[PDB]
């Protein structure tokens, strides 16, 4: 039976998702998360649809960029695998 070697399909996915623009997190859980977080700041809140979509576009753009920097940190350490310490270095240097 056929099996691709470790890495081939990963690369295929990179090309695939860098080619496209669709949101990568599921709508409903993201919305649920947003409402949960919002509740600890202000009671009785409602949300415009486009407000939640705005938050998702912003969040996903942020995470993708962070993963770019994280990847650079992993490669810097002569690895190809990203690890929490890569994220933490990236966020420290960003001033986060």
């Amino acid at each position: 039976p056929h099996r691709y070697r470790p890495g081939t399909v990963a690369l295929r996915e990179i090309r695939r998702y860098q080619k496209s623009t669709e949101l990568l997190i599921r709508k409903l859980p993201f919305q649920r998360l947003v409402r949960e977080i919002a509740q600890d700041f202000k009671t009785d809140l409602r949300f415009q649809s486009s407000a939640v979509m705005a938050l998702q576009e912003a969040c996903e753009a942020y995470l993708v960029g962070l993963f770019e920097d994280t990847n650079l940190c992993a490669i810097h350490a002569k690895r190809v695998t990203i690890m929490p310490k890569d994220i933490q270095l990236a966020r420290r240097i960003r001033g986060e």
Binding site: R26, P29, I37, K42, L55, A58, L66, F67, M83, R91
Partner: protein, 77 residues
């Protein structure tokens, strides 16, 4: 609800970020990071909402929060 941001979703985000291989510990870490981000933005957004004496967070509330955090977003004005 943070666990609703699933492993394959985070993987897709990482792929778009150009990542080829991913440690198992990334996912939880990512979630924490995401939460912090969301919290900050939303905290500001709601502040705007409250100033306008509204109970509905608008797209503009979010846009202003993002702008004032140096993360300008185009497309939702």
């Amino acid at each position: 609800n943070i666990q609703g941001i699933t492993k394959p979703a985070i993987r897709r985000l990482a792929r778009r970020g150009g990542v080829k291989r991913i440690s198992g510990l990334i996912y939880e870490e990512t979630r924490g990071v995401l939460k912090v981000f969301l919290e900050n933005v939303i905290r500001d957004a709601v502040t705007y909402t409250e100033h306008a004496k509204r109970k509905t967070v608008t797209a503009m509330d979010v846009v202003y929060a993002l702008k004032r955090q140096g993360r300008t977003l185009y497309g939702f004005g």
